[PDB]
Short mmCIF file of C-alpha atoms and ligand atoms in Angstrom, two decimals:
data_model
loop_
_atom_site.label_atom_id
_atom_site.label_comp_id
_atom_site.label_asym_id
_atom_site.label_seq_id
_atom_site.Cartn_x
_atom_site.Cartn_y
_atom_site.Cartn_z
CA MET R 1 -14.49 39.57 45.46
CA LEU R 2 -16.39 42.79 45.86
CA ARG R 3 -17.20 43.34 42.11
CA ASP R 4 -19.10 40.05 41.83
CA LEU R 5 -21.01 40.55 45.04
CA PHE R 6 -22.12 44.02 44.18
CA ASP R 7 -23.01 43.04 40.53
CA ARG R 8 -25.28 40.27 42.14
CA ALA R 9 -26.77 42.45 44.87
CA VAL R 10 -27.81 45.07 42.31
CA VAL R 11 -29.13 42.49 39.88
CA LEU R 12 -31.26 41.36 42.91
CA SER R 13 -32.21 44.68 44.18
CA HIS R 14 -33.54 45.94 40.84
CA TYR R 15 -35.27 42.77 40.02
CA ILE R 16 -37.10 43.16 43.65
CA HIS R 17 -38.05 46.71 42.88
CA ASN R 18 -39.59 45.80 39.50
CA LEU R 19 -41.62 43.21 41.13
CA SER R 20 -42.70 45.37 44.00
CA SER R 21 -43.75 47.98 41.39
CA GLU R 22 -45.66 45.64 39.31
CA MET R 23 -47.30 43.97 42.43
CA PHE R 24 -48.49 47.41 43.63
CA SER R 25 -49.96 48.20 40.20
CA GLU R 26 -51.73 45.08 39.64
CA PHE R 27 -53.19 45.25 43.18
CA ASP R 28 -54.34 48.80 42.46
CA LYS R 29 -55.95 48.31 39.10
CA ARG R 30 -57.84 45.34 40.35
CA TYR R 31 -58.95 46.44 43.93
CA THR R 32 -58.33 50.03 44.63
CA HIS R 33 -58.41 52.01 41.65
CA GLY R 34 -61.80 53.44 42.57
CA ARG R 35 -61.11 55.09 45.90
CA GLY R 36 -59.04 57.52 47.96
CA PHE R 37 -56.73 54.75 49.35
CA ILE R 38 -53.65 56.95 48.20
CA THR R 39 -54.78 59.63 50.64
CA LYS R 40 -54.99 57.00 53.29
CA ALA R 41 -51.27 55.66 52.30
CA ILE R 42 -49.78 59.13 53.64
CA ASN R 43 -46.91 58.57 56.27
CA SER R 44 -47.80 55.00 56.96
CA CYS R 45 -44.25 53.20 56.41
CA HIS R 46 -42.74 51.20 59.48
CA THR R 47 -39.28 52.25 58.18
CA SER R 48 -39.90 55.99 58.11
CA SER R 49 -38.38 56.49 61.50
CA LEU R 50 -35.19 55.35 60.31
CA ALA R 51 -32.63 58.17 59.36
CA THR R 52 -32.42 57.64 55.55
CA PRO R 53 -30.90 60.05 53.03
CA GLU R 54 -33.49 61.76 50.96
CA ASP R 55 -31.30 63.15 48.35
CA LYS R 56 -28.01 62.58 46.64
CA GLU R 57 -26.24 65.07 48.86
CA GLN R 58 -27.26 63.54 52.04
CA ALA R 59 -26.29 60.27 50.51
CA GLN R 60 -22.83 61.49 49.76
CA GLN R 61 -22.53 63.01 53.55
CA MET R 62 -23.25 59.59 54.80
CA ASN R 63 -20.24 57.50 56.22
CA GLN R 64 -20.22 54.11 54.20
CA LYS R 65 -20.23 51.62 57.10
CA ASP R 66 -23.47 53.40 58.43
CA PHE R 67 -24.85 53.54 54.87
CA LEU R 68 -24.47 49.64 54.37
CA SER R 69 -25.84 49.01 57.89
CA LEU R 70 -28.87 51.18 56.92
CA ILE R 71 -29.48 48.96 53.83
CA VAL R 72 -29.15 45.80 56.03
CA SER R 73 -31.65 47.28 58.63
CA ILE R 74 -34.17 48.11 55.95
CA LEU R 75 -34.00 44.56 54.47
CA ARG R 76 -34.11 42.77 57.94
CA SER R 77 -36.96 44.87 58.88
CA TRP R 78 -38.83 43.53 55.94
CA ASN R 79 -38.60 39.81 56.67
CA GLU R 80 -41.61 39.88 58.85
CA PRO R 81 -44.22 41.87 56.68
CA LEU R 82 -43.17 39.92 53.79
CA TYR R 83 -43.70 36.64 55.46
CA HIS R 84 -47.41 37.58 56.77
CA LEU R 85 -48.03 39.13 53.28
CA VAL R 86 -47.48 35.72 51.60
CA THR R 87 -48.99 33.66 54.28
CA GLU R 88 -52.25 35.96 54.30
CA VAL R 89 -52.56 35.75 50.64
CA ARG R 90 -51.73 32.27 50.19
CA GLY R 91 -54.25 31.31 52.63
CA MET R 92 -57.16 32.94 50.47
CA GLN R 93 -59.65 30.77 48.93
CA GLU R 94 -59.57 32.28 45.53
CA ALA R 95 -56.11 34.12 45.61
CA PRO R 96 -55.04 36.33 42.89
CA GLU R 97 -52.29 34.43 41.21
CA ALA R 98 -50.31 37.25 39.70
CA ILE R 99 -50.19 38.99 42.99
CA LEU R 100 -49.27 35.87 45.12
CA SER R 101 -46.45 35.10 42.68
CA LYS R 102 -44.76 38.29 43.08
CA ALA R 103 -45.11 38.45 46.83
CA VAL R 104 -43.57 34.90 47.04
CA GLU R 105 -40.66 35.91 44.88
CA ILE R 106 -40.04 39.03 46.53
CA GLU R 107 -39.98 37.19 49.76
CA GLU R 108 -37.42 34.54 48.49
CA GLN R 109 -35.18 37.05 46.68
CA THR R 110 -35.05 39.58 49.77
CA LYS R 111 -33.61 36.92 51.77
CA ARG R 112 -30.81 36.21 49.07
CA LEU R 113 -30.16 40.08 48.78
CA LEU R 114 -29.62 40.09 52.56
CA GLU R 115 -27.16 37.41 52.29
CA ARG R 116 -25.09 39.18 49.54
CA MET R 117 -25.43 42.22 51.75
CA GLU R 118 -23.97 40.39 55.07
CA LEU R 119 -21.46 39.09 52.86
CA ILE R 120 -20.60 42.60 51.58
CA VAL R 121 -20.38 44.10 55.08
CA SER R 122 -18.01 41.49 56.48
CA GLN R 123 -15.85 41.95 53.55
CA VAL R 124 -15.74 45.98 53.67
CA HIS R 125 -15.91 46.31 57.26
CA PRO R 126 -14.65 43.03 58.76
CA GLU R 127 -14.46 44.06 62.46
CA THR R 128 -18.02 45.44 62.70
CA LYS R 129 -20.58 45.86 65.40
CA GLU R 130 -22.85 42.84 64.99
CA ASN R 131 -26.01 44.49 66.41
CA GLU R 132 -29.61 44.32 64.81
CA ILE R 133 -31.49 47.59 65.26
CA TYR R 134 -34.03 47.66 62.73
CA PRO R 135 -37.57 49.16 62.95
CA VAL R 136 -40.39 46.89 64.11
CA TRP R 137 -43.42 46.43 61.49
CA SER R 138 -46.55 45.51 63.59
CA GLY R 139 -49.28 45.81 61.13
CA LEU R 140 -50.50 42.31 61.01
CA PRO R 141 -53.92 42.96 62.84
CA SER R 142 -54.90 45.33 60.08
CA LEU R 143 -54.13 42.84 57.27
CA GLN R 144 -56.36 40.65 59.14
CA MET R 145 -59.40 42.91 59.72
CA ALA R 146 -62.73 42.01 58.66
CA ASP R 147 -63.84 45.63 57.78
CA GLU R 148 -62.83 45.17 54.08
CA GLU R 149 -62.33 48.72 53.11
CA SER R 150 -59.83 48.85 56.14
CA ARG R 151 -58.26 45.58 55.04
CA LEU R 152 -57.73 46.80 51.31
CA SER R 153 -56.22 50.01 52.67
CA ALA R 154 -53.62 48.15 55.16
CA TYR R 155 -52.76 46.17 52.10
CA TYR R 156 -52.35 49.32 49.96
CA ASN R 157 -50.02 50.84 52.32
CA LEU R 158 -47.98 47.76 52.56
CA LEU R 159 -47.41 47.50 48.95
CA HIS R 160 -47.05 51.16 48.69
CA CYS R 161 -44.51 51.17 51.30
CA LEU R 162 -42.50 47.94 50.02
CA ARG R 163 -42.57 49.79 46.39
CA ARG R 164 -40.88 52.73 48.01
CA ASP R 165 -38.29 50.69 50.28
CA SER R 166 -37.34 48.30 47.59
CA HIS R 167 -36.64 51.31 45.39
CA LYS R 168 -34.64 52.90 47.88
CA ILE R 169 -32.61 49.92 48.81
CA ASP R 170 -31.77 49.58 45.14
CA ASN R 171 -30.89 52.99 44.85
CA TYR R 172 -28.63 53.16 47.80
CA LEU R 173 -26.77 50.03 46.51
CA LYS R 174 -26.02 51.75 43.30
CA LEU R 175 -24.55 54.52 45.17
CA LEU R 176 -22.46 52.44 47.24
CA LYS R 177 -21.24 50.20 44.55
CA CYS R 178 -20.03 53.42 42.64
CA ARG R 179 -18.48 54.99 45.64
CA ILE R 180 -16.74 51.78 47.12
CA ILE R 181 -15.61 50.09 43.83
CA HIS R 182 -15.30 53.17 41.35
CA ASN R 183 -14.61 56.07 43.56
CA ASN R 184 -17.55 57.61 42.11
CA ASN R 185 -16.63 57.32 38.52
CA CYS R 186 -19.25 54.85 37.23
CA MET G 1 -68.47 88.25 35.28
CA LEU G 2 -67.39 84.70 35.80
CA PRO G 3 -64.86 83.33 38.29
CA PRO G 4 -62.23 80.58 36.78
CA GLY G 5 -63.21 76.97 35.94
CA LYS G 6 -61.90 74.22 37.87
CA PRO G 7 -57.99 73.90 36.77
CA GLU G 8 -56.10 70.57 36.46
CA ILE G 9 -52.51 69.60 37.41
CA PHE G 10 -52.20 67.21 34.49
CA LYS G 11 -48.51 66.38 34.19
CA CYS G 12 -45.27 66.28 36.37
CA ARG G 13 -41.95 64.97 35.60
CA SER G 14 -38.31 64.64 36.86
CA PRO G 15 -35.62 64.81 34.21
CA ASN G 16 -32.81 63.45 36.77
CA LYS G 17 -34.11 62.62 40.24
CA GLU G 18 -32.83 66.10 41.34
CA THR G 19 -35.54 68.56 40.18
CA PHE G 20 -39.08 68.17 38.91
CA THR G 21 -41.77 70.40 37.17
CA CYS G 22 -45.53 70.19 37.25
CA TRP G 23 -47.79 71.76 34.62
CA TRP G 24 -51.56 72.74 35.12
CA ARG G 25 -54.28 73.80 32.71
CA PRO G 26 -57.10 76.17 33.19
CA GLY G 27 -60.55 74.66 33.29
CA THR G 28 -62.78 75.11 30.24
CA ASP G 29 -66.06 76.91 30.82
CA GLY G 30 -65.07 79.38 33.30
CA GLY G 31 -63.77 82.81 33.57
CA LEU G 32 -60.36 84.07 32.48
CA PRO G 33 -57.81 83.74 35.51
CA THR G 34 -55.83 86.69 36.54
CA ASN G 35 -53.68 84.82 38.93
CA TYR G 36 -52.67 81.19 39.83
CA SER G 37 -51.43 79.79 43.15
CA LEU G 38 -49.81 76.33 43.64
CA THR G 39 -49.38 75.14 47.17
CA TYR G 40 -48.45 71.68 48.49
CA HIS G 41 -47.48 70.06 51.50
CA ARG G 42 -45.25 66.81 52.00
CA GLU G 43 -45.92 63.72 53.71
CA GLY G 44 -45.26 63.92 57.59
CA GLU G 45 -45.28 67.68 57.81
CA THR G 46 -48.51 69.94 58.03
CA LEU G 47 -46.43 72.98 57.02
CA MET G 48 -47.85 74.54 53.76
CA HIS G 49 -45.59 75.86 51.04
CA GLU G 50 -45.72 77.74 47.99
CA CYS G 51 -44.58 77.07 44.48
CA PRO G 52 -40.91 78.13 44.58
CA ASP G 53 -40.53 78.98 40.84
CA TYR G 54 -43.20 79.87 38.46
CA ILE G 55 -40.84 81.24 35.85
CA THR G 56 -38.46 78.39 34.99
CA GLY G 57 -40.91 75.68 33.35
CA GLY G 58 -42.55 78.38 31.42
CA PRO G 59 -46.20 79.07 31.15
CA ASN G 60 -48.78 77.34 33.90
CA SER G 61 -45.78 75.50 35.50
CA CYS G 62 -44.28 75.13 39.04
CA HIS G 63 -40.59 74.02 39.07
CA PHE G 64 -38.92 72.47 42.08
CA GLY G 65 -35.08 73.12 42.27
CA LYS G 66 -32.87 70.95 44.19
CA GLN G 67 -33.52 72.51 47.39
CA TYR G 68 -37.20 71.69 47.10
CA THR G 69 -37.01 68.21 45.58
CA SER G 70 -36.65 64.90 47.31
CA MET G 71 -37.40 61.26 46.69
CA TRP G 72 -39.45 58.72 48.52
CA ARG G 73 -41.68 61.47 49.88
CA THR G 74 -45.36 62.14 48.72
CA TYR G 75 -46.17 65.65 47.49
CA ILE G 76 -49.69 66.84 48.05
CA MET G 77 -50.41 69.52 45.78
CA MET G 78 -53.00 71.89 44.54
CA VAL G 79 -53.63 74.86 42.33
CA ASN G 80 -55.96 77.45 42.74
CA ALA G 81 -57.34 79.97 39.83
CA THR G 82 -58.52 83.46 40.66
CA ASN G 83 -59.97 86.42 39.26
CA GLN G 84 -61.70 89.46 40.66
CA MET G 85 -64.99 87.32 40.50
CA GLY G 86 -64.04 84.38 42.53
CA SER G 87 -61.73 81.50 42.75
CA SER G 88 -61.63 77.57 41.90
CA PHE G 89 -59.36 74.78 43.31
CA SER G 90 -57.91 71.85 41.42
CA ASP G 91 -58.29 68.44 42.78
CA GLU G 92 -55.42 67.53 45.08
CA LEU G 93 -52.64 65.57 43.28
CA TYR G 94 -50.38 63.00 45.05
CA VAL G 95 -46.94 62.85 43.47
CA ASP G 96 -43.83 60.94 44.18
CA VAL G 97 -40.78 62.22 42.44
CA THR G 98 -39.67 58.48 42.45
CA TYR G 99 -42.14 57.51 39.82
CA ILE G 100 -42.30 60.45 37.46
CA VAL G 101 -38.57 60.07 36.09
CA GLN G 102 -38.19 60.61 32.37
CA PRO G 103 -34.68 61.57 31.18
CA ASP G 104 -34.16 64.09 28.30
CA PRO G 105 -32.89 62.11 25.06
CA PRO G 106 -29.25 60.93 24.52
CA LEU G 107 -26.79 63.45 22.93
CA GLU G 108 -24.15 63.49 20.19
CA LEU G 109 -25.43 60.20 18.30
CA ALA G 110 -22.58 59.41 15.61
CA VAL G 111 -22.46 56.75 13.38
CA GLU G 112 -19.62 55.02 11.49
CA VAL G 113 -18.77 52.21 9.06
CA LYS G 114 -16.11 49.91 9.87
CA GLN G 115 -14.58 47.41 7.70
CA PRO G 116 -11.65 45.56 9.47
CA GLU G 117 -9.28 42.82 8.02
CA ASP G 118 -10.91 39.40 6.90
CA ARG G 119 -13.52 39.90 9.63
CA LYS G 120 -17.10 40.91 9.11
CA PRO G 121 -17.76 44.82 8.80
CA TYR G 122 -20.07 46.61 11.09
CA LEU G 123 -21.84 49.83 12.08
CA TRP G 124 -20.66 51.42 15.01
CA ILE G 125 -23.10 53.67 16.82
CA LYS G 126 -21.81 56.07 19.51
CA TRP G 127 -23.58 58.50 22.00
CA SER G 128 -23.59 60.43 25.43
CA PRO G 129 -25.93 60.67 28.20
CA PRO G 130 -28.28 63.66 28.58
CA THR G 131 -26.65 66.40 30.31
CA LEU G 132 -27.45 66.85 34.12
CA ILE G 133 -27.95 63.03 34.83
CA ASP G 134 -25.36 61.91 37.63
CA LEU G 135 -24.18 58.66 36.54
CA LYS G 136 -20.70 58.60 38.14
CA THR G 137 -21.97 58.55 41.78
CA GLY G 138 -24.67 55.87 41.12
CA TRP G 139 -27.51 58.29 41.79
CA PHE G 140 -28.91 57.64 38.22
CA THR G 141 -28.81 54.65 36.19
CA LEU G 142 -29.56 54.79 32.52
CA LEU G 143 -30.30 52.13 29.87
CA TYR G 144 -30.45 52.70 26.19
CA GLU G 145 -32.21 51.63 22.94
CA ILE G 146 -31.19 52.08 19.41
CA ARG G 147 -33.47 52.02 16.47
CA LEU G 148 -32.85 52.11 12.63
CA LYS G 149 -34.35 51.72 9.26
CA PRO G 150 -34.05 52.67 5.73
CA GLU G 151 -36.67 55.17 4.17
CA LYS G 152 -39.78 53.32 3.45
CA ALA G 153 -39.26 50.00 5.48
CA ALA G 154 -42.47 49.16 7.31
CA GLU G 155 -40.59 48.46 10.50
CA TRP G 156 -37.85 49.90 12.75
CA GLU G 157 -35.09 47.41 14.03
CA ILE G 158 -34.69 47.85 17.62
CA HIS G 159 -31.28 47.04 19.53
CA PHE G 160 -31.33 47.16 23.45
CA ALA G 161 -27.93 48.67 24.40
CA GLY G 162 -28.19 48.25 28.07
CA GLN G 163 -25.81 50.70 30.02
CA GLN G 164 -23.35 50.94 27.07
CA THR G 165 -22.56 54.13 25.22
CA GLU G 166 -21.62 52.40 21.97
CA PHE G 167 -23.05 49.50 19.96
CA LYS G 168 -22.11 47.32 16.96
CA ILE G 169 -24.53 46.40 14.24
CA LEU G 170 -23.55 43.67 11.73
CA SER G 171 -26.15 42.79 9.26
CA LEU G 172 -26.98 45.71 7.00
CA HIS G 173 -27.84 45.92 3.36
CA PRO G 174 -24.84 47.16 1.34
CA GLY G 175 -25.87 50.28 -0.63
CA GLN G 176 -29.00 51.22 1.63
CA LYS G 177 -29.11 54.59 3.65
CA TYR G 178 -30.32 54.14 7.23
CA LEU G 179 -31.82 56.47 9.79
CA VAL G 180 -30.68 55.91 13.43
CA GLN G 181 -32.09 57.06 16.53
CA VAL G 182 -31.28 56.66 20.38
CA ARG G 183 -33.28 56.97 23.42
CA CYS G 184 -32.81 56.17 27.16
CA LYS G 185 -34.90 55.12 30.14
CA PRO G 186 -33.96 55.26 33.95
CA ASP G 187 -33.56 51.85 35.67
CA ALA G 188 -37.07 52.68 36.75
CA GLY G 189 -39.10 55.13 34.89
CA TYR G 190 -40.10 56.21 31.31
CA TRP G 191 -38.38 56.36 28.10
CA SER G 192 -37.11 59.68 26.69
CA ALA G 193 -38.20 60.90 23.46
CA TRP G 194 -36.03 59.65 20.43
CA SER G 195 -33.04 61.51 19.62
CA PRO G 196 -33.00 63.42 16.27
CA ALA G 197 -31.85 61.05 13.50
CA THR G 198 -28.33 60.74 12.22
CA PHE G 199 -28.09 59.23 8.63
CA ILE G 200 -25.69 56.68 7.34
CA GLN G 201 -24.86 55.51 3.65
CA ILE G 202 -23.90 51.86 4.01
CA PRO G 203 -21.32 51.50 1.26
CA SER G 204 -21.31 49.08 -1.99
CA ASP G 205 -18.42 46.89 -1.11
CA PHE G 206 -19.82 45.98 2.21
CL1 CL A 301 -42.40 54.77 28.60
NA1 NA A 302 -37.31 69.76 36.02
NA1 NA A 303 -46.36 79.31 35.79
NA1 NA A 304 -32.95 67.81 46.77
#
């Protein structure tokens, strides 16, 4: 039953984006406010190499099956950095409690969203290609660096990229909900 | 005799995630400028562009139409002020269209009293999304808030309406006139301004 899955997918996605957003802010206000970290954030996202729609018209031009697989690849691709984000932060001596609680919730909710999406794929395209080809993140040594300025900016990009991708996923789900269930008459 | 002061890009906004506009202001304490030039590039590009439209957003503004606007891609932008004596550049401004979204106010706010049979009467509020937002494709998502108050009350009553375009308010004082406004935000972004007020007299026999 599509309508219940989508509703729940979009509740999760919007919640995840909201948390990524507040996490990035809180990290910024209390670690990077004073510096040019934003200028170092440019082009730094492990998913940028995927072919993603950048506007409503590209979104519309995109085959539905491919669009869904795209959301799946993006989410699969974030399992790994979210895991190390939580691990690294939790392992700190005096770890920022508001930042850590978001990261943990995002980590858990991302998994659940991926299940709802998997359920959606196998309902809407039941004879699908069963092939992972998501982009690899391999930024763990930079989170682990001892040069504190370099560390803070690896983190900054990670949170900056998480805020973007969580937004994007959320928006793409809304497009697909409207197209699949409502023929674009939401 | 003086070249221009250092100008500032102080505001960008997108009404609907399809276009956006930026505004700058002349620096104070420098010469009068006779020209401005806004240039930018986007993340992952090198290629430098000019503002594509200096007219549409009015004075000291750059407007990016649909063919120049995209989400999830930083714009790195700068404005220069020039006169015959010299020139001055703004700080670079980093902008993601994704985070400057603020819709215009909802439209056609209409209000009515409804007194049905042997069931509580209600105020029934109706409105429409701003024009030029695409809700139908799921590109855009809007949430709405209503406020209302009689003249001279110290506080507004606020009612969250989520994604609905109509709403029901039960407990109102019979005989009181209320001012009603509506506003809206994107699922992510900033609230619009409040719509203009409509006024409603709640009758005596309520
Ligand atoms: Cl706001
Ligand atoms: Na605009
Ligand atoms: Na202008
Ligand atoms: Na565009």
